[PDB]
Amino acid sequence: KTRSSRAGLQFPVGRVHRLLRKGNYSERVGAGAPVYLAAVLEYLTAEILELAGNAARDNKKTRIIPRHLQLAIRNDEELNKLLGRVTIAQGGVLPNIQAVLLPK
Amino acid sequence: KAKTRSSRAGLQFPVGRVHRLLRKGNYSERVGAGAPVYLAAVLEYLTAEILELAGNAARDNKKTRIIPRHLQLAIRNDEELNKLLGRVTIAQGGVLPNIQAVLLPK
Amino acid sequence: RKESYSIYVYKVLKQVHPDTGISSKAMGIMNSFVNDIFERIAGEASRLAHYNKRSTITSREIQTAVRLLLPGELAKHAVSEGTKAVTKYTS
Amino acid sequence: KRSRKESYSIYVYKVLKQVHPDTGISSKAMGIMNSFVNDIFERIAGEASRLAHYNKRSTITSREIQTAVRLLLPGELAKHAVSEGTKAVTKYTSA
Amino acid sequence: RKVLRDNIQGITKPAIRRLARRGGVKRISGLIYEETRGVLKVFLENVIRDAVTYTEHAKRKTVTAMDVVYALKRQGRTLYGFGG
Amino acid sequence: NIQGITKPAIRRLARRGGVKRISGLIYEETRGVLKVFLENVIRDAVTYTEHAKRKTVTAMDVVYALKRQGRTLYGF
Amino acid sequence: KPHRYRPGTVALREIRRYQKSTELLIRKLPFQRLVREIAQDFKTDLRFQSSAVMALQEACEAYLVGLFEDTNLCAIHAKRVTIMPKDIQLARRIRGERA
Amino acid sequence: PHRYRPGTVALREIRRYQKSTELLIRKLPFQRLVREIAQDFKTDLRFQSSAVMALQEACEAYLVGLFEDTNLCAIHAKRVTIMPKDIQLARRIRGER
DNA sequence: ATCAATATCCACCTGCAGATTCTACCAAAAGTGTATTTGGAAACTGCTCCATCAAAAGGCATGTTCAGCTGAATTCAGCTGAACATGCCTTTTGATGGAGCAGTTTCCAAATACACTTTTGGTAGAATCTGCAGGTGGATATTGAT
DNA sequence: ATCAATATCCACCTGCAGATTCTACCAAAAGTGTATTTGGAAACTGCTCCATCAAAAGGCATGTTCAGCTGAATTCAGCTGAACATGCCTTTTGATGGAGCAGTTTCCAAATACACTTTTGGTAGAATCTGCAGGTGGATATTGA
Ligand SMILES: [Mn+2]
């Protein structure tokens, strides 16, 4: 009967709703907000996990580490935009070398 | 009789407004009584700082009325105020004159 | 005490990649991401409310905020899921 | 059907006379002033909320404002800020 | 009314010139003009998009100055003098 | 102490950065900017701790301070 | 003579001139059309407040003036006095607008 | 004997490091640096072992980044050797100064 | 462009321990049932403000000429910074132990929140002012040709 | 080494559009009487955090050689600035119609407020497990001949 199952989401809607109340974001929190936010947070996670998987899978590892995540985030143009100001610990940088630096 | 709370602290800025705006702002659940004054005082001060430097700019330019240009100059000439308002742009502010060294004749 | 989204991220991870698993550190990175977005979406949402002299945040406020915070396809898909989960929850 | 919106205009002006009696400010400049006041107002209160929230406090003390000011204001400006506030508060409580 | 199109060329060369002068630039390459326009067009889009989004949330058919201001703030390009 | 930041280390940092040739002057210079980074981050960091009243700088204090500086950090 | 000013001399004169004044360099009517065109594409039949269009024009001009200074420093840095798209593009890259 | 031409190892270094994520700066010296800086602000402070990492992670991440920008400025001036001159520009453009 | 002789990477291989993930259960929340407040959607409709259009006009944007001087190309070489073999010591790391100290309770006196009622302090028109914007002119440079 | 040639500067001028004042209502602080919390304030832990203390081993500091990178100096093709001539269209001014904010009212659909009853998600052990980490053996990438 969890409100989350009703919306069919893995993320805790209750948690989000309780978090919204204690946040001071507003006077009153609509019932639809919690599921919506919670929902939106789920998808985003989904999106990044999937790409890391690939990174992980691509690297030959069955376990995701920060590097996989950074690779995934930075290779994707849109995800980069969203987390441009953020920095992942142990993320390293994508491997890029200027053309001119290469031997001619 | 009746006394304004600001007068109690001897400020020009409206402590009642600052307190009420803090309440309605959802910044916190409880707003102490000291905070509104403390804050109200901080802005008053900052306002006087900015007004001070502009004034001179107006006098420097032989104007008895402060216009934006003076504010921009005030804010950009002072190192610290500049910093505080680094990301901001003043409408009609213009820019501090500055020609690059290399660009000049010789 | 000391609650984290760690448990939830794992489930989501399993759907997309049953075969894969996530390190402790990477998990933390994921928790941080969730939190930031959460704070970022909620913040804006709050502002939409205030700018409009509203005293309550509708799911709509969460959505409009999502259109400003997320770009292109990320936004589209993001907006859809929200409306979809809401339409289903209400039913 | 009046629709009265308030501004810090009256207050900025009083302060303008304090620093320079002879000087005056224009409409366009006033607007700029109100914005400055409002901007700074939001920074301190918003940044003050964070302090309170980070420490699981349910109330914003005059103290939290101060700590926010230190973070928000740079150098001497910050120092003077704190001074003027504390003065105001100490004076207020003592009355 | 009248159909609007290719108004981005409204931003003349002298005007782009003038903007550069105030910027302190003494010499300007010819390719600059068209490039500038490009950047300007992008700036506007991004700021107007948000602006109008704030308008759409309000349901108003008019974009007030505020809309523009709130917009600019999000963009980290805060503006003083119009609505707050 | 700032000299703890050895020249070869700085050279390494630059590599990951994509640099191939480093002037000999950079080092002191790379050292200087670094010193500044911490000064600004820690300062705001401590202020947060002091408001807290703790005598220990949590990993958290740093995070909050980094966000204020705009240099957001994940994983701690 | 005809009296003529050596090249670059006037540019220096313009620089001193426009930096002192605060008026908007771009022509008001054309900007407005541009702003109304772009906005029309996002939402049809929108209406703009006289003050809203100004706001937009102030921020734009400000942005560009600002971009030009940085660009100028990139030009001076590359040993050239002439700004170039190569400069603008770099400047924005460093700014992070589009790395 | 065999000697690697100049700049060959450099590129070997670049390729190598970008591949690994480990922090390059020596941990103890850094922590020593941090404590020193922290003391000017407050005395007898204590740091969570984790608190230092955050600090170190941030600095190396920032420093690595600064160099990327530094390079573009050095490349942009027709050079291939980063100079203090380049660093300042990148920072001046960034708004740090 | 090979030939050849270094030094490097680079898969294929393969062993246990530092992590991961799975278990086994208890306070903290979340979900429910009821009972109330109330926020703001719908329904007018006053009425600014925005869109438009007509007109005259000169501020300026365009195009074209010309040729000054900057950007780009070359060439050279002095010397800065990579590559390295070298010799040595500060960083690692690993417990070990003690304690400064985050983090919990548990009351509670001081400080806030509420709920109503007065009481001014502001804000939005008017009535009155007055810097200063927009011109004019000489004095004062600053430039660029000789 | 000169000097017209032109633009830039500064003070004087003067009505008028943009202040400064001047006033009446009334929205919202201020004053009071209670009804709740709140964050400290002593006591006390269980811990993370300093301190040594102790070996070794990478990792850092150095003095060497010289390869090729950055700067300086020389050139000159032609890109871009300065001037005019032309006449297009952005400005100014003002008039109107009416789309569409916004202030009011009206009141249900929705959110908030407890009192409990349940279920879940964080912890601390308990039972697996992916990689770190070396370790060959073999093209690969460099560089000199
Ligand atoms: Mn169109």
Author numbering:
A (entry chain G): 15 to 118
B (entry chain C): 13 to 118
C (entry chain H): 33 to 123
D (entry chain D): 30 to 124
E (entry chain F): 19 to 102
F (entry chain B): 25 to 100
G (entry chain E): 37 to 135
H (entry chain A): 38 to 134
What does the paper say about this structure?
The basic unit of chromatin is the nucleosome core particle, which contains 145–147 base pairs of DNA. The DNA binds on the surface of the histone octamer, composed of two copies of the four core histones, H2A, H2B, H3, and H4. On the other hand, the N-terminal tails of the four core histones and the C-terminal tail of histone H2A protrude from the nucleosome core particle. In the present study, we determined the crystal structures of four nucleosomes lacking the N-terminal tail of one of the histones, H2A, H2B, H3, and H4.
We compared the structure and electron density maps of the tlH3 nucleosome with those of the wt nucleosome. We found that the electron density map of the H3 K37–R42 region of the tlH3 nucleosome, which is a binding site for DNA, was very ambiguous as compared to that of the wt nucleosome (Fig. 4A and (B)). The H3 H39–R42 region directly binds to a minor groove of the two DNA gyres in the wt nucleosome: the side chain of the H3 H39 residue is inserted in the minor groove of the entry gyre, and the H3 R40 and R42 side-chains form hydrogen bonds with the atoms of the sugar ring, the adenine base, and the phosphate backbone of another DNA gyre. In the tlH3 nucleosome, the hydrogen bonds between the DNA and the H3 R40 and R42 residues could be disrupted or weakened. Alternatively, the H3 K37–R42 binding to DNA may be stably retained but more variable in the tlH3 nucleosome, thus producing the ambiguous electron densities. However, previous analyses, such as single molecule transcription experiments, molecular dynamics simulations, and FRET measurements, indicated that the deletion of the H3 N-terminal tail enhances the transient unwrapping of DNA at the entry/exit regions. Therefore, we prefer the conclusion that some histone–DNA contacts are disrupted in the tlH3 nucleosome, thus reducing its stability. In the present study, we found that the H39–R42 region of histone H3 becomes “less stable” and/or “poorly organized” upon the deletion of the H3 N-terminal amino acid residues 1–27. By contrast, in nucleosomes containing tlH2B (lacking residues 1–24) and tlH3 (lacking residues 1–27), the initial phase of disruption clearly occurred at lower temperatures, as compared to the wt nucleosome.
